[PDB]
């Protein structure tokens, strides 16, 4: 299988990257031509954040962290299913039973993280209600 046609494509796309950047740099009118008030550098008002107009100045939930952390074990489970795809016929029943076992052990992990509700954001800080109880004497 030849890939010299593919190589020229990758090279052209690499050339297309330089063209997109520089075409802006050669077609925009000179700062003097428009208003001359300054370049992007000195014009710090124009080169700044957007805060809807008013100038101002990540303790993320642990549930978000466990979403990203648990992505890695579940990704290596999916990527290790790749060898079974292109060899499903020649491993027969034996490799099919092994594959199912390879999935059951990982599912017991899915059960564990489903019961603990690890991914739920939860609301421990707020949403409290109480019963007004009179304390007659």
């Amino acid at each position: 299988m030849l890939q010299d046609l593919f190589n020229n494509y990758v090279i052209l796309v690499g050339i297309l990257g330089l063209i997109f950047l520089g075409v802006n740099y050669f077609i925009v009118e000179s700062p003097r031509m428009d208003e001359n008030n300054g370049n992007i550098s000195d014009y710090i008002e124009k080169s700044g954040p957007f805060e809807c107009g008013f100038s101002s100045f990540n303790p993320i939930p642990i549930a978000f962290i466990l979403v990203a952390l648990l992505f890695l074990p579940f990704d290596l489970e999916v990527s290790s299913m790749l060898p079974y795809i292109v060899s499903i016929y020649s491993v027969g029943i034996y490799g099919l039973i092994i594959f199912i076992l390879f999935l059951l052990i990982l599912i017991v992990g899915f059960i564990y993280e489903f019961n603990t509700k690890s991914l739920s954001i939860t609301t421990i800080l707020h949403k409290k209600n109480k019963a007004l109880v009179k304390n007659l004497y």
Binding site: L66, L70, L72, E77, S79, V86, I98, Y112
Partner: protein
Amino acid sequence: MNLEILDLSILGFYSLISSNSFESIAILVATIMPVITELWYNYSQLFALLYTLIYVGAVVILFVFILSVINEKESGLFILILVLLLDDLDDNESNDNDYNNVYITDYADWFNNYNESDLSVIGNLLFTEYALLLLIISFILLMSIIGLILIVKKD
């Protein structure tokens, strides 16, 4: 003009001067890409794509995920080029001169009429011959799922 040398010299230049964690994560991506590209050509196209799918797609974006969580806070040109040049001189990883100067070939044969990809053979052996290695791996993955939750989960 083996341009793969110039990519690493740039990479070796920025590894000596990186200060924050943004550049440190950049050295990771700037190292896999030469690893993937030098595997795509030459040695193994299958493991170039496995590296992209597993390293870049899975373990690299996790680094930048936690860097946004951790924090973002806070040499001389002569010594760097002197060090890089000194690092550049001696690049022979092995000292078997004949093994590095004499070329070899293989002879093909037509005895293998059932031609199938490497990933076909790897699955053929991993799911039959070394099914213990495959099963322990799912066991190591299982411990991580439990291991991540016990370390990080608050309550």
